[PDB]
Amino acid sequence: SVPSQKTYQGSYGFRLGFLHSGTAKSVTCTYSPALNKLFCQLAKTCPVQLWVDSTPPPGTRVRAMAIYKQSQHMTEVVRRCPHHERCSDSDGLAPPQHLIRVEGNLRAEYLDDRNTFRHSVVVPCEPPEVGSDCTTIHYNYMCYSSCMGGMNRRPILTIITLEDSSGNLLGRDSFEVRVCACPGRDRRTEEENLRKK
Ligand SMILES: O=C(O)c1cc(-c2ccc(F)cc2)c(-n2cccc2)c(I)c1O
Ligand SMILES: [Zn+2]
């Protein structure tokens, strides 16, 4: 009915990481550690790092799913709004209803859960490239937080799960997301609101 959001490093020490992009007016994606919140523009690249202490087995996968953050909306499926689901911006792989896409990975799979109707996107784990210490997934969010008939100004969380080949849980992390026109300004505003409180 509601997916768990409990942080769980698990046996492999799984956790996310984010770049330090700053809060200039021109920034397209920026992460606030104080808020545990990603701010991004519509359909722009959101780099999310995956970190582990030890290598999970071959066949491990990484899934992303959005849920509403407020408890009174958490049973509602997060989906694209009535406008964006019809705007024919498909990449050939993501269903037009899905909020979260993975960019530039032909092995991404998109699930419409047959029991919960929730959407998710899952990719195989791949080792870091030589010279790197982590792997990065590039996500896109395909509706604004404000879209009427969709998120409708309600905050969402993205839950990232590390899963075995059967889909069993190996690790979990999460972050809030706001999809907005000016992520740098909005991050600055919300961090100031937190400081004043
Ligand atoms: O250091 C490593 O060997 C390493 C290895 C993997 C990895 C590679 C292949 C596989 F099948 C399962 C896991 C990995 N990873 C990729 C997505 C989630 C974690 C990471 I981050 C690593 O740092
Ligand atoms: Zn929309």
Residue numbers in the entry: 96 to 292
What does the paper say about this structure?
The tumor suppressor protein p53 plays a pivotal role in several critical cellular processes, including cell-cycle regulation, DNA repair and apoptosis. Mutation of Tyr220 to Cys creates a narrow, hydrophobic pocket on the surface of the p53 DBD that reduces its thermal stability by approximately 4 kcal/mol. While wild-type p53 is moderately stable, melting at 44 °C, the Y220C mutant rapidly unfolds under physiological conditions, which effectively abrogates p53 signaling and drives tumorigenesis. We have developed a novel class of small molecules aimed at stabilizing the folded form of the p53 cancer mutant Y220C and reactivating its tumor suppressor function in cancer.
The same alignment highlighted a possible merging of the 4-fluorophenyl ring of 2 with the central iodinated scaffold of 4, therefore suggesting an aromatic ring at C5 as a possible substituent to grow 4 into subsite 2. Substitution at C5, aromatics and flexible linkers towards subsite 2: Substituting the iodine of 9 at C5 with a phenyl, an electron-poor 4-fluorophenyl or an electron-rich 4-methoxyphenyl resulted in less potent compounds in each case, with thermal shifts of 33–35 in the range of 0.8–1.0 °C, translating into Kds > 100 μM. The reason for this is unclear, but is likely to result from steric clashes arising from the dihedral angle between the two phenyl rings (θ ≈ 45°), as revealed by the crystal structure of bound 34. Despite its reduced potency, the binding mode of 34 was very similar to that of 9 and consistent with our initial merging strategy.
